[PDB]
XYZ file of C-alpha atoms in Angstrom:
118
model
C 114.091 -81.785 -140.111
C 114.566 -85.253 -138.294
C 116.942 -87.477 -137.864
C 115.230 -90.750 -137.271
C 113.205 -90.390 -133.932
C 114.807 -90.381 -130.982
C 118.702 -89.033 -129.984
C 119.288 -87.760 -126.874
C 115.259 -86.252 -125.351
C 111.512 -87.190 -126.743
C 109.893 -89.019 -124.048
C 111.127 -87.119 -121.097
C 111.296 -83.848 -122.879
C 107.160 -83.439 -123.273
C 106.715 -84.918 -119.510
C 108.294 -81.927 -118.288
C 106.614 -79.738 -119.671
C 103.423 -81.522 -118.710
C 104.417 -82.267 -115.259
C 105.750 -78.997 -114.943
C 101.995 -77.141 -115.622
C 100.019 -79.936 -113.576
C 101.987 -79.071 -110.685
C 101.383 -75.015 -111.144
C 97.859 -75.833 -111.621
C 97.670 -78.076 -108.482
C 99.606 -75.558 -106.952
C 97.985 -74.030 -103.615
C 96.640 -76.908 -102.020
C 97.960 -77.074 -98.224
C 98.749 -80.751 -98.436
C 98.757 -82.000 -102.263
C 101.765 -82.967 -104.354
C 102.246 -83.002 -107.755
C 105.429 -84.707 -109.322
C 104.323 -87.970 -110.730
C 102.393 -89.331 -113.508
C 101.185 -92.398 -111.671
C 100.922 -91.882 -107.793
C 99.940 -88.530 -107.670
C 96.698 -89.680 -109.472
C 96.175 -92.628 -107.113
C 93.909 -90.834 -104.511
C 92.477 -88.565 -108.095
C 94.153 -85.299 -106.264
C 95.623 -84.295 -109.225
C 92.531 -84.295 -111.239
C 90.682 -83.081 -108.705
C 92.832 -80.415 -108.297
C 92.316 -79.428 -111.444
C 88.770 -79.547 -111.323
C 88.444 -77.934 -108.677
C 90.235 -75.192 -109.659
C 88.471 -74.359 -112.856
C 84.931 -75.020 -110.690
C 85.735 -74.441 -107.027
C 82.024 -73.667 -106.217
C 81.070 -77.119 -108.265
C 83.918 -79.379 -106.855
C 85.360 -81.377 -103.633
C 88.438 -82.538 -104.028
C 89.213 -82.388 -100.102
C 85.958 -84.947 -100.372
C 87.082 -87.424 -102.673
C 90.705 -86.743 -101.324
C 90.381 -89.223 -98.572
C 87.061 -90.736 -99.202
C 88.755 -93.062 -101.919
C 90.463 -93.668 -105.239
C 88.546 -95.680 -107.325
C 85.692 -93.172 -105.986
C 87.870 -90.110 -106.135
C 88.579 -90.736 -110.370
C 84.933 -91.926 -111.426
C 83.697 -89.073 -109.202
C 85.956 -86.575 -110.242
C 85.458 -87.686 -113.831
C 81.914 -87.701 -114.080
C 81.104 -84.035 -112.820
C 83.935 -82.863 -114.842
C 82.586 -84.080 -117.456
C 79.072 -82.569 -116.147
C 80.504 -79.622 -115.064
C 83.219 -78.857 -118.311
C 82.174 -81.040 -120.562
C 85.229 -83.243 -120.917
C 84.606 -87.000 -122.032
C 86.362 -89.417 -119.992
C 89.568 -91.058 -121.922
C 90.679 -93.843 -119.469
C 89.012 -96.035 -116.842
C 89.210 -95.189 -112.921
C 91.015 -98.659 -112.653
C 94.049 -98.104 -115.189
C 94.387 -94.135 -113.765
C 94.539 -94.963 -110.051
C 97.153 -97.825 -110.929
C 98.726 -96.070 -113.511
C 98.604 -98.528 -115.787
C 97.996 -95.895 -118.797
C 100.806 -93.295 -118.886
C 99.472 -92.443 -122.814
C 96.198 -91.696 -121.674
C 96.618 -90.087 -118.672
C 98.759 -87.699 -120.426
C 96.418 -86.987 -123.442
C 94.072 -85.908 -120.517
C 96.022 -83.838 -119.593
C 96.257 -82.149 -122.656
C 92.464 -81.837 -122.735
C 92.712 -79.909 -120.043
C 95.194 -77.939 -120.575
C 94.251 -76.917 -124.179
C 90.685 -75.919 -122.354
C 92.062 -73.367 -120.178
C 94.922 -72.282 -122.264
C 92.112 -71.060 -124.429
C 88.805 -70.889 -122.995
């Protein structure tokens, strides 16, 4: 099958389905939204989120939630990495500006794939 690449959905049509699990995962949080592939990683609540979720007695999001970006993303990155295992794909500096929509979603992947399975 095929046409050529690209007709009517491609781009948009895997971000939903991505942003669409982040946000169930990130879901229960009393003060965290989930609906962008940019912002929402600014402050590293998304990834936190997720971290913390998987390791709730190894994590602090609500830490790194306020405490900074920059510190939120190598922080978060680093013990989830200690903690899971996952090697870091992007910098801190091109996730918390969003300046890598490729990478942040391949990350996403990562984690996803390690909890659909487990």
């Amino acid at each position: 099958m095929g046409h050529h690449h690209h007709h009517h959905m491609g781009s948009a049509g895997t971000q939903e389905e991505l942003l669409r699990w982040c946000q169930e995962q990130t879901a229960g949080y009393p003060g965290v939204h989930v609906s962008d592939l940019s912002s929402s990683w600014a402050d590293g609540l998304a990834l936190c989120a997720l971290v913390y979720r998987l390791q709730p007695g190894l994590l602090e999001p609500s830490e790194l939630q306020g405490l900074g970006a920059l510190e939120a993303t190598a922080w978060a990155l680093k013990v989830a990495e200690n903690e899971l295992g996952i090697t870091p794909v992007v910098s801190a500096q091109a996730v918390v500006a969003g300046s890598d929509p490729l990478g942040l979603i391949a990350y996403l992947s990562h984690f996803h794939s390690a909890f659909k399975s487990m």
